[PDB]
Structure formats: structure tokens, C-alpha cells
Amino acid sequence: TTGTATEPFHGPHQAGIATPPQAHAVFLGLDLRKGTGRKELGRLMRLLTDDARRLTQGRPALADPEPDLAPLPSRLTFTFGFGPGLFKAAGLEKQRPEGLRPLPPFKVDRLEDRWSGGDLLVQICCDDPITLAHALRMTVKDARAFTRVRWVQRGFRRSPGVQSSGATQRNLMGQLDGTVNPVPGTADFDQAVWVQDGPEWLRGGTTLVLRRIRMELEKWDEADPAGKEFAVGRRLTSGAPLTGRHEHDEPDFDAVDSAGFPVIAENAHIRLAHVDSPRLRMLRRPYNYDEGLTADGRSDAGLLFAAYQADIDRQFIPVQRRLDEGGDLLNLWTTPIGSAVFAIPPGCDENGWIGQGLLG
Amino acid sequence: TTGTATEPFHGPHQAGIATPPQAHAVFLGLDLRKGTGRKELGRLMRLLTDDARRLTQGRPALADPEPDLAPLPSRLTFTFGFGPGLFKAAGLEKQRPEGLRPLPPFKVDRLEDRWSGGDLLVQICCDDPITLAHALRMTVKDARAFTRVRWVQRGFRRSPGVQSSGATQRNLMGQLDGTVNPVPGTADFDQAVWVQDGPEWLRGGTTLVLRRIRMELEKWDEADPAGKEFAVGRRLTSGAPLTGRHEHDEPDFDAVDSAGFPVIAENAHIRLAHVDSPRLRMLRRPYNYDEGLTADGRSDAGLLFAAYQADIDRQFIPVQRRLDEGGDLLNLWTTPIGSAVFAIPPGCDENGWIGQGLLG
Numbered sequence A, B: 001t002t003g004t005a006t007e008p009f010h011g012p013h014q015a016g017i018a019t020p021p022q023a024h025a026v027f028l029g030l031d032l033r034k035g036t037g038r039k040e041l042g043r044l045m046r047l048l049t050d051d052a053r054r055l056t057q058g059r060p061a062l063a064d065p066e067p068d069l070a071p072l073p074s075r076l077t078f079t080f081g082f083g084p085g086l087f088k089a090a091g092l093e094k095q096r097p098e099g100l101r102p103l104p105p106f107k108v109d110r111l112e113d114r115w116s117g118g119d120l121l122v123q124i125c126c127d128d129p130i131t132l133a134h135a136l137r138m139t140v141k142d143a144r145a146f147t148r149v150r151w152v153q154r155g156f157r158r159s160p161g162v163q164s165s166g167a168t169q170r171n172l173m174g175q176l177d178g179t180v181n182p183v184p185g186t187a188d189f190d191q192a193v194w195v196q197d198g199p200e201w202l203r204g205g206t207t208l209v210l211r212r213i214r215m216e217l218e219k220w221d222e223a224d225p226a227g228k229e230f231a232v233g234r235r236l237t238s239g240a241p242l243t244g245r246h247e248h249d250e251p252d253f254d255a256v257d258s259a260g261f262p263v264i265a266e267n268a269h270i271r272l273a274h275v276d277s278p279r280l281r282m283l284r285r286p287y288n289y290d291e292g293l294t295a296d297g298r299s300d301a302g303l304l305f306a307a308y309q310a311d312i313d314r315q316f317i318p319v320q321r322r323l324d325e326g327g328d329l330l331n332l333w334t335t336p337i338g339s340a341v342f343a344i345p346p347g348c349d350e351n352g353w354i355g356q357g358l359l360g
């Protein structure tokens, strides 16, 4: 069933990346306390490893504060990530990937400290929110002594069983989101996602760019539907490129309209975001968020934009830079308010723990 | 797939009450603007009725800001409720039920204005959070001109398919929650829930007591495990009464231990909460909430306690008063921080609108 289903914890890679995105996610951003060094980090990651090892398979954690909430794992997964500040605290500043650093400033940025940065990431995904809540509590319980909570970001996708697996789901702007994306279990995916160069310990792992992007829905509603599709380069209902018919049709960036102007605008989102080389693409694995209203009924909603790639400098920044300097029409209705980066180590087997190659 | 499943909007009763509780809920508490009188309330409820009429069946609302999010309704339901202030503004004090008033003070209360009161309730329930978020957006769009958002309370239960329908689900304290409840499709349920006395307009309707109850999970983890079961009167895992073996075993309130003391404490939750007459019982239809963390790792979680009954004075207050005056052991780890009451009108058909019998 949806409840008894599990995702393996062990493997060459950490789960929660190639894993088809579950219905719910929480991104826990932690800062290290002063007394938390390499020794303490080792004890912590061993604690959290075994917690994930048990919980993801429906078994209570060690010293579980509520073991009856451990069953029904619902494809629970844990993904741990190390921020730039982690390495200095560990005395391993040399093994920090040179590419692992806070993203540079962009003109559209309205970043807030409460949604940015972080020394240690715990990404917990699950098809069930009760199972997720319990997993979060256990995580905090074992991380409490060594860290402070910098932020916690919750997001959702479709509930399990609403749409078939692999089918593209819509975001809170009504747009089909995830059409062009590296496919798990393919060569292009492995090259695009998993690290092969750089520091040894990170090989088999990846890097995460997590950006909290607010959807300016008040402005969005006042926009012209033709203008909305034009801004993206795809139709709302079908999800097809404006040059095409079906969702999976290849956009024609050389096509022009009756006026000789590009059908897909020069500053259309998918044009500026596109990279011709599949091996340089980023894995987008986003979650939607919707959190409360002002008295005048203005929404606080958007996207937890989670991008995974082997090299931030080669695979993310160039794209984000083109969106910014290219004057992406979508920037009129979206605003980055948070940004964090993490190095996600390789997976482990029954005889190890996440981050052993670094902290061991 | 389950996205296409719907619940009837039309009927003698509003949906979202007898309806088997969906995986997600938003309780939207609205305060009327100064100029919003009976005329304005009529226009508002006609707008909201039609929105629900279309959206619950997977059709876009009129002036829908994002029509592509209307399909796949996932058992979306709307339940509208009128607070005490609604009747004042509409000049229909004569039609206000005697019992429709803010609840009396209780010792355990730590109520906050930001979680209490409200003139107009829109209770939106759905098995899918994207569908839910869209429904909320449309509700606010048409309500903005007439009302201010007093509060929005988001809650969740198990995702669809995680547990078989009707099976008791656990709360964030790990406790099986919902064992003793009136059952739809029985005469006792109708007697307990649907109004058949008082002013004419409300017949076929019901009343809602909505209380935001914080869970003191800090103390809860520190609590003695045997004391936790003793506090409730049931075992954690099995859910059985301490006098029994299975969940649905009848609690024996006359039973004593070998020392001659009651097996179920005189101040046990279920003892103080129990009522002999099934027809006097309240319908409990709660949702769980989990909302963020302090720097030092303290959770902010609890229960959205939604109780439905034909008569607040006869079915809710007597129970709540016994829990308070009786010194319910569960009060050591639970704290009411919000309280609101609403009169829920009967259902409508085509050509009709919710609250028409009152406001029309």
C-alpha cells in the first residue's frame, strides 16, 4: 500500500534525489553550535544515519519519542547535506568543493536570512505528512544538542495516487512543472547529477541549490493569459511549447510568428533556462508551499526550488545568470526570498554512515 | 487514481461533516468589514456557493484565477459557518441560536485572539493540497471585498491510501484518535449532529466548536510512558481501554485493580469525556497541525479540534466543563490557544445558495 511502501536507505547514492518526488517534504536547515566540531559531527551523523536507517523501513528509531508513528513509512527518505560553514568547523576546509559557496547576488534577489544559508541540511521527503512530522521530530531530537534550527521549509506536491507516476504535476501558478528534466536511471542523469571530479569524498554525491521563491499571485492574476504563456514559452493547459502541440514536443527556438518575431520570446523563461547539452542540465525536484494570509487576503505562496547538479558553477549559475541578465519575463511574477547551498555526500551501506568519507 | 473522486455539493446537508475526513483541511476565519450588511452577505454567499458548486466537481469557478487547477477535485468539500457577529451585522439577532455564543472560560484556557472568534467560517477539506490551495485562493478572491482574514488554520491527517477508510488514525502524540464517535448512516448520528430544534433556518444544519489545542511535546517526551496511558485510559499501541484488549472494547469504568483503585483513573481523559447516551455525543472530526521550530528545537504542533453537534449547550460544554473541573490528566500536555463557534446552515440544491433561508 501507499503506507507500507518503502524506499531503500542504503546504496551508492543517498535517497531523495533520483527517488521520484514524494507528496511531502521538509527542508531542515541547521547551524552548528560553537562546541560542535569534527568529533561531534561524527557522533551526530551516526545518530541521524541510524535514525533514517530504521524510520525509512517503518521501524522505530533508537530512543524514539513516539515509536507508534514509525510504521507506515510511506516511502520516507532522508537526504543529508553539508553547507560551506560545515567544513571549517570540521577543520576540513581543504575538502570543501571550491564550487560550494553561497550563490552570487542577482538583480531579482530579495533574500532573507531566515530562509538562507545553513551549515547542515536534513531533507526529509514522504508520501504521508504524519510520518513526515514524526521523522522531523526524531531528527531534531538528535540534532538538538549540536545545532540550532536556522529554518524549516515545508512543501507539497500532489497527494499519492492523484496522478500516475512520472506524469507532470502543476505548480500553484497552474503551470505544468517538470517537463524538461533529467530522467532517473539514464546516462545523462548520472552525468548531470552525480559528482565525478573534485574532492574524493563527494564522488557519488551531488550538490543542492535550495531557493525559496515567492509567487506574486496578485500580479499574476492581473496578467493577460496570452501574456502568461508568452512569458514562459508554453501553453497553460496542454503544457506544449507555443511552437508545438503536445507537452513533450521539442521547443522550436528558430520558429517565428507572422511578424517575424520569435514564437518563443527571446526573454521567455524556457529559452533563457535552456541548455543544449543534456549532461550539463540540472535536476529540478521542487515542492510547492502555501503559508497563510494577510488581513486583506494576500497569499504567501510559492515554490521550494530544489536543483541538484554535479557542478553549481557550470550547471546552475550560468542558467540563473541568463534568467537575470536576459530579463526573464517570469521574473515579473516570481521573487527569490531565500537561498542555500549544500554538498550532498554519497550514500552508504549497512557498514557505514552518511558523511563517513569526510568526517570519519 | 483518486484525483477524479468527488463529494456531492448539493443535498439537505452541507458536505464536510458526515463526509469521511479528507487528508487536508483549511479553516478560514473571516471578519466582516464595516460596510458589510445583510445585502452584502447575500452577494458574498451567492459567490462562494457557486465557487464551491463548480470547484467541488472539478469545474473552474467564475473568474477563476487558475482554471487548470480546478480539475482533479480529490473529494473537495466546502462547509460554511456563521459566527455570532454575522447575525449582528445582518440584523438577524432573532434568528441567532441561544447557544451560539463564545464559549465560557475554562481554567486550562490560554486563548489568543488570533486563533479565536470569527464572523464567517469557510471550512475547506480535500485529499489533495494543491486542489486545496487553489480552492482557498478562489475563496479569498471573492471574499476580500466583504471581509478581513482573522485567521487561517491548516491541518492534515493521513494521506489517501495510507490507511483503509474508516480505520482509526493517530495524532501527533502517537495516540489513536477517533475511536468513540457517532457514525454516519445511523439514526443516532442524525440525532446528535443535525439540528431539529431552535430557529427554522438552521434545521438540517449543525454547529461547530473549533478549538486550536497546542500539544506540549516537550513535557510529553519527558512524561512517564505508563503515566501517558494512565492519563488517557487507553494503551498507546493497541488503543484498547486499560480494562480491555482491543481498540473497540467498551471501557469498564467500574473496574478496579488488585489494590482496589479504578483501572481507568477518576480523572482519566476518556472517563471525564464519556457520555452514556450516544445521541448526546459530539462528532469529533479533527486535523493535526505541525508548524515550525524554535532555534533550540522546540516544536509548535497540536490538534485542530473540530466538534460538530446539534446543541452546543447540551453536547459540548458539559463535556468540556467536566474535563476542566475534573482535572483531566491530559491537560498536563495539552493547552487550548484558540476557540471559535459557528452555526452551519443546511445544504442547498441547484438555484439555491448556502444561508439563503437566513439571509434571503
Ligand code: HEM
Pocket: A171, A173, A175, A176, A177, A178, A179, A180, A181, A213, A232, A234, A251, A269, A270, A271, A273, A274, A275, A282, A303, A305, A316, A319, A320, A334, A335
Ligand atoms: C521560481 C518559480 C519558477 C517557476 C514557476 C518555473 C516554471 C517553469 C515552467 C512552467 C517550465 C516549463 C515546464 C518544464 O520544463 O518544467 C520551466 C522550465 C525550466 N525551468 Fe523554471 N520556473 C521557476 C524558476 C526557475 C529557476 C529559478 C530556474 C533556475 C535554473 C529554473 C530552471 C528551469 C529549467 C532549466 C527549465 C527547463 C527549460 C527547458 O529546457 O525547456 N526555473 N520552469
Ligand code: HEM
Pocket: B171, B173, B175, B176, B177, B178, B179, B180, B181, B213, B214, B215, B232, B234, B251, B269, B270, B271, B273, B274, B275, B302, B303, B305, B316, B319, B320, B323, B334
Ligand atoms: C490535544 C487534545 C486532545 C487529545 C490529544 C485527545 C485525545 C483523545 C484520545 C486518545 C481519546 C481516546 C480515543 C477515542 O475515543 O477517540 C479521546 C477520546 C475522547 N475525547 Fe479527547 N483529546 C483531546 C481533546 C479533547 C477535547 C477538548 C474534548 C472535548 C469534549 C475531547 C473529547 C473526547 C471524547 C468525547 C472522547 C470519547 C471518549 C469516550 O467516550 O470513551 N477531547 N481523546
